[PDB]
Amino acid sequence: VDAEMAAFGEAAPYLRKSEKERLEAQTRPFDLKKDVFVPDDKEEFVKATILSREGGKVTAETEHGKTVTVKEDQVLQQNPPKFDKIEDMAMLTFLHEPAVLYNLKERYASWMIYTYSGLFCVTINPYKWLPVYNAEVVAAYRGKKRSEAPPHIFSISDNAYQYMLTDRENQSILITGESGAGKTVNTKRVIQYFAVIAAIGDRSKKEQATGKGTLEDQIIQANPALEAFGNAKTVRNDNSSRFGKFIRIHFGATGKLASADIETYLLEKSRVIFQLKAERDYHIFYQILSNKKPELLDMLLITNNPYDYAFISQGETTVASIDDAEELMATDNAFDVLGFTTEEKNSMYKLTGAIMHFGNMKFKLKQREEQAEPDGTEEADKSAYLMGLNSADLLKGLCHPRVKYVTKGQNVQQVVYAKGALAKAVYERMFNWMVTRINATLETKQPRQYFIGVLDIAGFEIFDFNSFEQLCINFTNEKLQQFFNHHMFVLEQEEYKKEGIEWEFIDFGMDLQACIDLIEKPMGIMSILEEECMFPKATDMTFKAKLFDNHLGKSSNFQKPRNIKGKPEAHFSLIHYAGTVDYNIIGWLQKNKDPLNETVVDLYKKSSLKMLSSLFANYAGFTVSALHRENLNKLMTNLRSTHPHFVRCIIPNETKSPGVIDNPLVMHQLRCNGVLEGIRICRKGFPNRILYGDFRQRYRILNPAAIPEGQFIDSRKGAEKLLGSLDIDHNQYKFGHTKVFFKAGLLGLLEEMRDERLSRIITRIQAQSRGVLSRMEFKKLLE
Amino acid sequence: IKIEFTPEQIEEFKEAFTLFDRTPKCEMKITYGQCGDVLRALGQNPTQAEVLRVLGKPKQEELNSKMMDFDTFLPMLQHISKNKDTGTYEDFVEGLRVFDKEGNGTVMGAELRHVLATLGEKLTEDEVEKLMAGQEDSNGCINYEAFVKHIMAG
Ligand SMILES: Nc1ncnc2c1ncn2[C@@H]1O[C@H](COP(=O)(O)OP(=O)(O)O)[C@@H](O)[C@H]1O
Ligand SMILES: [Mg+2]
C-alpha cells in the first residue's frame, strides 16, 4: 500500500493497486500492431496476436491458443499495458466495445468494482461484501474531487453534496441497471452517506410531528417499510424492487438536512395475485406468516402456512438469503420510527390479510345457468370482517354488479378476474398511502433551499416477451438517456466555445427525439392507446390496426414484429437508442383502463375500517399511460433543475457467482445503459485533447526540427508547426487556446508513429555507438 | 552502380582494406562478417540490417567462411556513402529523453544499459560495458545530451 492510499485503510487494495503491483502486472510483451481484439461467438471478443494479413483477411492466434481467420475491418486494437485497469476509461487510446469490456472485467477480477467512463460511475456487482463502505473510507472521501481519489460511489455522493454548497444548486444521482445489478445497494450507500455528513438543522419539535429519533434515522427507516410492500424475490434478485423510486433529500442553508420526499413509479400490481414458478409475492405476506408476531395471525384470522393462500403460493415461498421472521421485526420497527399509529399499522396488516382470503373465495356456476354464485362463504366472511364490510353485500356485489339500474351478469371467470382486480387496487392504493404517510414524517422546521434527488429505476432491458409495462419503462429510459445526451452536449459545447473551436453539431439529445415523439406526441402510440380506450367497441385488433395505419409508413422508428421461432407472439417493433424491441399488444386496453367492479368499490367507500374508506374516497372510474406521462413530466422537470451525476450498475452473471463475468451479458448492458452511447456522441466532437506543453513534451520526437531546442518558445506555434509537417490528415485536428483537439483515432496513429520513430532512433544511436567501439579497436591497432 | 570516388581516394580505401586482411597469403580478401568493421573504420556508421542488406542477405556460415575482394567491396561502400539519414543530434537526444522520467536531464545507469541491450539492434553485454567507459555520476545518473556529444565525436 502506497502513501497516497494509506488514508483508505483496509479498503486500499479494493480501490487502487500499488505502483509496484501495477508495473509487475503490466510487464508483458506488447506489439501495438500484432496484439488485437477479434470477434467470438461465445465470448463476444477475445484478445489475439496477428500472424498473417493475406487477401483482406487477417489470420491470428487468440488467448486459449486457437488459430482464427477474420475480416480486416472486424479486428480492433488493444490499448497498451500502460492503460490496464484504468480508473477513467475516457482516457483510453481505443474506446471500442472490447476496450471498455476488458478494462472493466480486468478491474473486477482484481475486486475493484468501481470504474469511471467519462461522466458515468460504472459498478459491477461483486456478490461478496468488500471492506470499502466503512467510516474510515467516508473520512478518506471527504472534500476530495473525483480525480483526487480512486473511483467509488462515495465520490459521487461527496461531490454532489460539495457542488450543491459551492454552486448553490440542486443535484441528482441517476442510478440505473437491471435486476440484481446493485441499484438498491448503491442507493442505500448514497443516502447513508448524506445522513453521516449533512449538517444538523433546526431540531425543535413541530405541532403535528410524529416519529422516533432524528430525520437521519427516519430517512433510513423508509427503506425497510417500502421494501416489505414493494420488494419481492424474483429469478434475478432475492430482494428485487418492483417499483421505481425518486427520493429528493432537501437541505436548508449550509448543507443542513431539512426534509425528504419519495415518488414511486410503475409498481408491479400483477405480483399481488400472481407469481411465476421460481418467484415469490411481496415480502410482507411471508413476514406476517413467519409467526414472529403471533398476535397478527389471530388478528388476520390466518394460518401460518403460505400454501393455504392461493394468491401467494403459486411459485416459491422461502428465500435462501431472507429470514422473514427478522424482517417482520425490522418492518414493524420502521413504521414506529416513521410515526405510524397502532391503528394505521394494524389496518395495513388487516388489509394484507384480507387480500389473502380474497384469493381463497371460491365460486361455482348456478345449475342450468351461466351465472356464478359463492362456493362457500367462510373465506368471504373473514375478508368482509377485516375490510369492515358486509359478507353478503360483498358476494352479491361480485356476482351481480349494478351498471349504467341494470344489474349485470357474471360467470366464474368474470368474478375471479374482478376480485383479483380489486385485491390489486387495494394493495396499490395502500402502498401509495404509505409513501404519502412516510413523506408527512420526513419534515423539520429547517426551510428548504436545495435538494439532492436520488433516482433508482430499472434500466433499459430487452426481454423475450415485451408488453405495456416494458413500453412504459423503456419510454422512461429513452427520456433519461436524452437527458444524459443533452447534458454531455452542453458540457462539450461549453468546452469548444471556451477553447475557441468552431465545431457545429445538433444536440445529442435530438438523436432520441424521433422515438420519444413516436411514443408521446399526439396520434403517437400512447395517444392511440388512450383514444382506443374511450371506445367500448374496441379490441386489441382495432388498436393494432390503428398503430399500423398511423405509423407503418411515415414513422421509421415503427416497424413490423421481427417474430422468430423461440420468442413468443409480437405485434410490432420499436427502434430505441439501445436497440429494437418487439412489443405484444394483448390486454393493453384493459391494463390502461384498469376496470374495477364499481358495486364493490361503493362498498369499500362505505367501510367501517377508516383506512379502506380513505383509499377509495376519491375513486373515479370511466388512465395508466396518462398517469405515467404526468409523473415522468414531473420527474424530468425536477431533473432539469439539477446538476446530474450518473451511476451505472452491471450484473456480472446469472448465477450470483462472485468474481465471474459472462461477456455477452456485460456487453448487452453496456449497449443499453448509456456507456457506449456516451462514447458514440463524444466521437462526433473531439474526444482527445492535450495541452500544448504536454504535446510538445511527448510528440517532439516526431520532427524535432519543427520545435527547435530553445530556452524560450511559444508552444501553440510549435505544436502547429510539428503537426503541419507530418504526413497526416490535417482536418483530423483543431487548435485551441490552451489545448490541441483531436478526432478519434488520430492519437492512435501519433503513438504508432512515435514508437516507429523511437525504435528507429535507438537503432541509429546503437549504430553510432558501434562506430565508437570500432574506432577504439582501430586507435589501438594503429598505435 | 556508378562510382563517384576520385582515383586518389580509391587507393586510400585500398590501403585501409589491406589492414583488415588477416590472411598470411595476403590475397587481399576479407570475410563477409568483418566487412562492417571496414565500413565503420572508413568514417561511416551503418546499421546491422544495412550491413546484411548490401551483402545480398548472407547466412551465418557465409559471414565466417565466404571471402571478398576489393573490386566487389567498392560498389557496396558507394551504397552506404549515399545514405544521409543517420539521425540529427536533436533526434538522438529526444530518443534518450523518453527514458528521463524525472525530466531533469539525466537517465539512470542500469536503464540505459538495458535499453541499448534490448531495444532495437541489441548491443552485447561487453559492447554495453565498453560504451560506458567514462562511467556515470555518484548515484549514476548518466547525463544524456552530453553522452550524445561523446558517441558522435569518438
Ligand atoms: N456493492 C455490493 N457489494 C456487495 N454485494 C452487493 C453489492 N451490490 C449488490 N450486491 C448483492 O447483490 C444483490 C442484488 O443487488 P440489489 O442492490 O438488490 O439490486 P437491484 O436493486 O439492482 O435489483 C444484493 O442484495 C447483494 O446481495
Ligand atoms: Mg432491489
Residue numbers in the entry:
A (entry chain A): 2 to 405, 410 to 627, 646 to 806
B (entry chain D): 46 to 199
Provide the authors' original text about this structure.
Here, the cardiac myosin converter/essential light chain (ELC) interface is described for the first time from a 2.33 Å crystal structure of bovine β-cardiac myosin (98% identity with the human form). We determined the 2.33 Å resolution structure of the Bovine Cardiac Myosin S1 fragment complexed with MgADP in the post-rigor (PR) state (PR-S1), a myosin conformation populated upon ATP-induced detachment of the motor from actin. In the two structures, interactions between the ELC and the converter are mainly electrostatic via a network of charged residues that contribute to the stabilization of the lever arm. The overall fold of the converter is similar to that found for smooth and invertebrate striated muscle myosins, with the exception of two loops displaying sequence variations, that we define as the top loop and the side loop. The side loop appears to assist stabilization of the fold of the converter, while the top loop forms a part of the converter/ELC interface. Thus, these structures provide complete atomic coordinates that are essential to evaluate the structural plasticity of the lever arm and to study the consequences of specific missense mutations in this region. The dynamics within the cardiac myosin lever arm were studied in 30 ns molecular dynamics experiments using coordinates from the PR-S1 lever arm structure corresponding to the converter (701–777) and 1st IQ motif (778–806) as well as the bound ELC. The WT simulation reveals notable internal dynamics of the converter (RMSD of Cα between 0.6–5.8 Å) linked to large fluctuations in the top and side loops.
Virtually all HCM is caused by mutation of genes necessary for cardiac muscle contraction and at least 80% of familial HCM is caused by mutation of two sarcomeric proteins: MYH7 (ventricular β-cardiac myosin) and MyBPC3 (cardiac myosin-binding protein C). The motor cycle of myosins couples ATP hydrolysis to actin-based force production upon the swing of its distal region called lever arm, including the converter. Although HCM mutations are found in all regions of β-cardiac myosin, clusters of mutations in regions such as the converter are known to be particularly severe. In cardiac filaments, the sequestered state would be a way to regulate the number of active heads available to produce force during contraction.
